[PDB]
Amino acid sequence: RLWALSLAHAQLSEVLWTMVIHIGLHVRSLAGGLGLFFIFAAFATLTVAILLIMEGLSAFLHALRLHWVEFQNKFYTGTGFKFLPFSFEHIRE
Amino acid sequence: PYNLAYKYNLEYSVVFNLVLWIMTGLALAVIITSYNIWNMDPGYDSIIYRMT
Amino acid sequence: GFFSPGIWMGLLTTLFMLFIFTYGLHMILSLKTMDRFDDR
Amino acid sequence: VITFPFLFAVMFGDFGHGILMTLFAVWMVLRESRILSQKNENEMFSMVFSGRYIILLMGLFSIYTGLIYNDCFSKSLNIFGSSWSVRPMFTIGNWTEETLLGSSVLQLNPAIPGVFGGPYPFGIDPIWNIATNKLTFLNSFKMKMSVI
Amino acid sequence: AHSFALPVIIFTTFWGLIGIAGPWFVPKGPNRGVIITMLVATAVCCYLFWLIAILAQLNPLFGPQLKNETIWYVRFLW
Amino acid sequence: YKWTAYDAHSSRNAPSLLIHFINMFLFSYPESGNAMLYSGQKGIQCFLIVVAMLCVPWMLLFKPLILRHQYLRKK
Amino acid sequence: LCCGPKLAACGIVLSAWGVIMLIMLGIFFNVHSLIEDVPFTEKDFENGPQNIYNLYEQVSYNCFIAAGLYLLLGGFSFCQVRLN
Amino acid sequence: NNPEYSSFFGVMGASSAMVFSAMGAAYGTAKSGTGIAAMSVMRPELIMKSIIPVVMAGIIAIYGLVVAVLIANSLTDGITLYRSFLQLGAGLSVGLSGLAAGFAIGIVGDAGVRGTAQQPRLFVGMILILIFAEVLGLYGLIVALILSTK
Amino acid sequence: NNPEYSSFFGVMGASSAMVFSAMGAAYGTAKSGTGIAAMSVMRPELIMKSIIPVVMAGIIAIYGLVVAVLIANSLTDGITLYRSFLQLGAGLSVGLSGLAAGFAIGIVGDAGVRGTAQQPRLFVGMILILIFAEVLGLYGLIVALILSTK
Amino acid sequence: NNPEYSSFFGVMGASSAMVFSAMGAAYGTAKSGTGIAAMSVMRPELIMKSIIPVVMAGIIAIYGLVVAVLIANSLTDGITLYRSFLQLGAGLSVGLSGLAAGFAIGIVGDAGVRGTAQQPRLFVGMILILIFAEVLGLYGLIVALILSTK
Amino acid sequence: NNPEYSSFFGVMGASSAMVFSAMGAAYGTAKSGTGIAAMSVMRPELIMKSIIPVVMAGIIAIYGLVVAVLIANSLTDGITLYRSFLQLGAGLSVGLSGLAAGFAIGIVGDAGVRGTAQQPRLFVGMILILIFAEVLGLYGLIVALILSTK
Amino acid sequence: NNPEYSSFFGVMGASSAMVFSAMGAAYGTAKSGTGIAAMSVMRPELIMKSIIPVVMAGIIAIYGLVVAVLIANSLTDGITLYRSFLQLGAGLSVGLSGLAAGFAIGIVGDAGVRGTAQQPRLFVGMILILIFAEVLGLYGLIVALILSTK
Amino acid sequence: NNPEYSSFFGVMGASSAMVFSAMGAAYGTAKSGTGIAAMSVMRPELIMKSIIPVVMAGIIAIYGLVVAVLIANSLTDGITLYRSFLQLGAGLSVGLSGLAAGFAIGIVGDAGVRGTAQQPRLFVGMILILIFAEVLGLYGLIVALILSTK
Amino acid sequence: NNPEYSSFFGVMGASSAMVFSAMGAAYGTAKSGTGIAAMSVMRPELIMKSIIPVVMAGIIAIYGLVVAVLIANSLTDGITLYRSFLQLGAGLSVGLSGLAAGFAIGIVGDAGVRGTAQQPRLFVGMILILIFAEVLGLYGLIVALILSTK
């Protein structure tokens, strides 16, 4: 999973770069400057939507899943009860 | 070069016949198995009536 | 060639008996049991 | 506290996103008093806020790992220490006017020509970020690293 | 050009002191146990990852495949 | 070991770690076709797998057997 | 115009991120006149390395232009949040 | 002088004779057992009599066994093809015939067992109709046997 | 002198025997298990008797294992093809016959087990009927054994 | 001397061993999961016992994984074809047999778990039935190993 | 000296891996999303936890990318055929195995998410079931990695 | 120098990319429009927000448009044949992967919008799940770009 | 020098373009007309505006008409084969892509018009969604035009 | 130098033009007549001005008749094949396009007449919609006319 997701992230990043922001560069001066503005904004938008959120979520979950499944199951066994003392916690509520 | 043939597999009919029907039967087995799984009936009961 | 007299004759007989198998199995698959028993 | 953010950073080893991820966590902490002492009916924002200290670390490690991966939005970071190969010596090694045929080919840079070598001080040598076979050199690393 | 020995010396000392000496210089507050745990776990996780990255690049079997224009550009750049 | 043991000078017929790993478990030691990582590896590969298999009885059944012993000794 | 402070605030973040990225990128093009190695070179490439330096200089200029637009965007979006 | 593949057709005859007959008997048994299970709850005294449809289904399987073995004991390496197709025909002849008979036994037996419990005077009629079904399977055997030596 | 690719048919036999027999036993097991879960929820005291259908299904699977192994141990590289067709026949004969037996076991098991709880006197009739299904599976084995050594 | 295309058979085997057994385990797990959800809402106290069908399902997939690796590690360019055919048959034997086992595990798990929700005494019978399905999967593994090393 | 169009099979491998993996992931996502949309109406507070089936399902598409690229990295003109079949098998192995896993994840996700809202104690059982379904996709990768590198 | 018909494969690639992606986008759009039309009766205020699923479909179609153009521009008459196959693989990879994405977008969009009408708090969850499906389609583009340029 | 039948693929392109595009428009027209008829009883006013989905369907057909003519005008007897394959691709690309668009137009128009009768504010949303489907049809035309002149 | 199989392609064009167009017109007529008969119960005064969908259907049949005659008159013995494929394309183009139109005419006619019965305002709308379907059929004729003379 560590490799599989690391590979995917790099590949999603590369294609988002290559197929979006590359287009913002041009041999025409003014057209390049103005276009790069709008193209980058789209690049920024996709960068967050695809990688910062979604893949970050996938990496979060899969890294956590490794913690629960492979690590804890070697020593962290059995169950107990949640400690729920009487206390004046609900002040903001 | 001299309109020579490319040696169209001696015993072609053997490899051909084998591969055709082997991959066809196996491909169908996958299709049918996939169909049966695709449409697995969860029962549509217990909690489904309330969630629907 | 694509087919030989041997291969072909085999396929021809195979299909006939395959159809027989299909027929038999078809009716076997479309075979149900009872939902409930009549009475005590 | 360390193990999980670390494993995340391995999965999310991208320097540029590590910055974004870190800054988000910092923002939440800096507004902690204003966000906490308020109503937040949207559980999605509350959830990430409650984990703001977990995210902070994930960002910090994502930067660390991204720099070793040498990937910042698919860009490498050349510190003027990239000495993988000495192209001038490439031409000496029986490569004369290869850029003529080069117009239609790649040509792989040989190992042990007697003039290449030396590890990159920190992370993957930037040169691989512009290669057509990155996808094998670095792919093997990540496979073996994941196992280790 | 680089040697492998020096990187190892510099980063092993850096992460070593953190994981070895760090715990010696810790407040006596209630978080002492947590701070020490983090100091050591961090140094081990970070050092190991880097050590893999650098060792994997020793004794390479092949070099990169570069495009012709890229090869030209580098010849006159580095 | 591979990273530090083999250079490009031995890239041809360079050992494949995945294949040796599988052959390790199966005690597969062909006369040729695969170079060994180091001399005596065959003995080491065989030993380690045997040990791993010998580890199974311990975790598999020796605990309940001793519990039965102590139970019947107490009884 | 107000447009909603939630959307003006997003513009501020996009504008700030953009100005940082565009300035840094333009510098990189100007210094390594490079990793990106995509300045849109000519196909009729002659034996003139100076032609590659000149291409990167053009790319760098374009980067700072885009940053200028983000500076203007951040200014406008900033005042919207303050007024909202 | 033996057309290769000559043995292939023959052995399929032995296979068909057994497999198709087993399919028929299996269906016949399944239907009969289902009808018996439903009937027997209310009138358990009829359980012993109700088994007959199942036995006949079994007989269908035997016809197939007889041909399948007869063919198997008739196989050699140097088969002249002529003999091979005769064995294939005999196999298919008893196979499909037994298969059809098994269906008749199952479907009729199911109705017969249920009807008999409601009206015992139907018991003999059930047996008569079922005998015909078996006679059909027999027919399949008789011709399949005759062909095996022609 | 031996035709090439001659081993293919015998190899398919060995696999066919195991797969079709497992399919039969699997169907019979699944159908019985459903009836058992539906039945024994009310009458758990029968839970240790309603298992038998399932055991018989397992026997269908063994028939297949015995032949599949018998075939595999009979294969070599230089097979005269004739032997391979014989191996294929033996494989299919037991495999597809066991498959038919599996349906007989399954349908009768479900119907019988649930019926038995409604009427305990049905138990013996259920077993006898299931016995015919096991016999149907065995007939396939008999032919397969005759062919596999022919 | 080696017929090109020969590797195609063995290669399809290594894949088939995993693909078909994976579909079986996938069915078993998916079918059991639905039954588990129904039980757990009615009573969560059994949530750690109704998981067993799923673990078993996984073991089936492993059976296939084992053969798929054994075949893959047995591939060569200069393949003698005979061994390639054995590898295809071995892969199919375990794959398709595990596939049958997967359906057997799923169907009985769902029925058993749903029944167990109402009758705790059903648990032991459910396990025994599940054992037969795991055994059905193993038989395939045994034959596949015999063929692949033959 | 290599056969013509030998890359044909390897190219289909790289594509098949991505195509079948997308099919699996898409199915898993579609079924999980349906359960979430129905579930979260009653308990919106679970809309965050309920995403897990969808996030995990995405791994199948990733596995497809990983193998599809790994194969693509090894596509050239002068392929010795042998290696091409290996690439085709690896592509199909991970793709069709990921497809099986996609089915497993989707079906259990729907039942799991709906059940969790009915009984939050189902969370742990849902996670365990999802894991085993994902493992099936992992097994596909394992075989592809061993085969594509042989 | 190469075989006539060498270009045929590449041509099918360019067409496959566009056609399958359009099929996916059309399906996603149709299902989204159906749910939206009904949603508008309860909550017309969501008519604007609920468009997003349809945009997602559109992007799938573009993925296909991009590759189809890249192939069409890259395809020549004197094609190397090797490259022709890669173009077909790239075309199918993006097209069929986008097609799968299309179904996920449609099913999730419809279920999400319908659930949102009942509970507006589900809107954010719908968007997140949709992001995964759109990325799954992009996975197809990534592989296609790797293949078509190799 | 090229095969006398090389012109076959091109003319199939011109035909396919028109046939599939007309089929798409025909489906979209039929679906819209059904919804419109029902809406018209509910309220006269919207009859006039409700025609638009049908017009869009017509445009899909024109897309195809344009390519079919372009191919027919360019198709000759002494065709270059390469160009012929391109024409087949261009024909299928626009035809099948328009066909997909026709379904989107049909389903969305039907649901949209029926909904709009209840909520007039939906009308604008309906048009916007139908716009995406028309754009999907255009995409097919774009690729077909590139291939036609390439 | 003319290939004989060339006349077959040609004559199949003339046949296709007539046969598929008659199928379309027949379908449109069958559906329109059914709707008219039901309509006549309540609104007999509309019977004569409800025949139009049927006339339009007939026009589709004519589209085909005209092309079939034009090809039939063009058929000769020494056909250069190129012309034969143009005749085949022209035949299919008009026939299958008319077939698609027949469905639109039929479905719209049925729904339109039934609606008109209750909402007389639908009549202009029914005609506008059906005009589009006739235009779709004409498109087929246009291409056929271009091809048949090329």
Side-chain angles (χ1 to χ4, degrees), chain A residues 1-7 9-11 13-15 17 43 47-48 51-52 55-64 66-67 71 92-93, chain D residues 3-4 7-8 10-14 17 20-21 36-39 54-55 58 69 71-75 134-135 138-140 142-143 145-146:
Chain A
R1 289 173 183 169
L2 294 166
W3 168 51
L5 270 62
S6 180
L7 187 147
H9 181 95
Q11 293 298 284
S13 180
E14 183 177 330
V15 72
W17 179 287
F43 179 55
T47 300
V48 173
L51 297 176
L52 186 60
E55 289 296 351
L57 181 60
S58 294
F60 177 101
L61 184 140
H62 287 79
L64 183 59
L66 289 171
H67 181 70
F71 181 55
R92 289 191 296 273
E93 183 179 359
Chain D
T3 298
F4 165 70
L7 292 172
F8 175 83
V10 172
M11 292 180 182
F12 201 67
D14 183 351
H17 288 80
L20 294 168
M21 186 64 76
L36 181 60
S37 297
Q38 185 175 309
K39 303 296 185 182
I54 295 169
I55 294 165
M58 289 194 289
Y69 285 122
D71 183 327
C72 182
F73 302 119
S74 302
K75 181 193 174 290
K134 180 181 177 181
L135 295 174
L138 185 60
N139 186 61
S140 179
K142 290 182 182 186
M143 290 173 70
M145 179 277 290
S146 295

Side-chain angles (χ1 to χ4, degrees), chain I:
Chain I
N1 292 332
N2 293 332
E4 186 50 80
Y5 64 90
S6 67
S7 68
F8 178 78
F9 289 122
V11 173
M12 293 299 102
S15 294
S16 294
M18 190 68 258
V19 171
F20 286 122
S21 297
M23 290 173 69
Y27 180 79
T29 298
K31 296 290 284 189
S32 296
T34 300
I36 293 166
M39 180 278 283
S40 64
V41 71
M42 294 301 291
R43 299 200 64 176
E45 64 269 24
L46 301 175
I47 195 168
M48 293 294 100
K49 300 295 186 182
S50 65
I51 196 69
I52 291 165
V54 171
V55 173
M56 295 211 206
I59 316 163
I60 291 302
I62 293 169
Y63 298 157
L65 182 60
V66 171
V67 173
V69 173
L70 181 61
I71 294 168
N73 286 341
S74 298
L75 303 176
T76 190
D77 52 354
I79 301 167
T80 60
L81 181 62
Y82 174 54
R83 187 178 297 278
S84 294
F85 286 123
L86 291 172
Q87 296 299 309
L88 180 61
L92 291 168
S93 179
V94 71
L96 295 171
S97 294
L99 178 62
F103 284 96
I105 289 156
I107 298 295
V108 173
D110 174 52
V113 169
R114 285 192 277 141
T116 298
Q118 296 299 309
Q119 173 52 257
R121 293 178 66 190
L122 184 59
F123 175 79
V124 172
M126 178 184 72
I127 300 300
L128 179 60
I129 294 168
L130 285 170
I131 277 153
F132 282 83
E134 226 28 51
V135 156
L136 294 202
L138 172 38
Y139 286 1
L141 181 60
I142 292 168
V143 172
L145 293 171
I146 293 166
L147 290 171
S148 67
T149 60
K150 182 71 180 69

Side-chain angles (χ1 to χ4, degrees), chain H residues 28-48:
Chain H
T29 298
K31 282 285 284 180
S32 295
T34 302
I36 292 166
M39 178 279 286
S40 295
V41 172
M42 294 178 71
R43 297 203 62 179
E45 68 270 25
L46 300 177
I47 291 167
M48 291 173 73

Side-chain angles (χ1 to χ4, degrees), chain D residues 19 37 58 60 72 80 134:
Chain D
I19 293 167
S37 297
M58 289 194 289
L60 293 169
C72 182
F80 302 99
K134 180 181 177 181

Side-chain angles (χ1 to χ4, degrees), chain J residues 42-90:
Chain J
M42 289 188 286
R43 57 193 294 179
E45 296 83 1
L46 300 174
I47 193 168
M48 291 295 103
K49 298 294 187 182
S50 66
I51 197 69
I52 291 166
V54 173
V55 173
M56 295 220 190
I59 308 158
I60 301 282
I62 292 169
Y63 296 155
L65 180 61
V66 171
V67 173
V69 173
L70 291 168
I71 293 168
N73 197 59
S74 299
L75 299 174
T76 190
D77 54 351
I79 191 71
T80 60
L81 183 63
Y82 175 55
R83 289 188 178 87
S84 181
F85 287 1
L86 289 168
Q87 290 173 1
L88 176 61

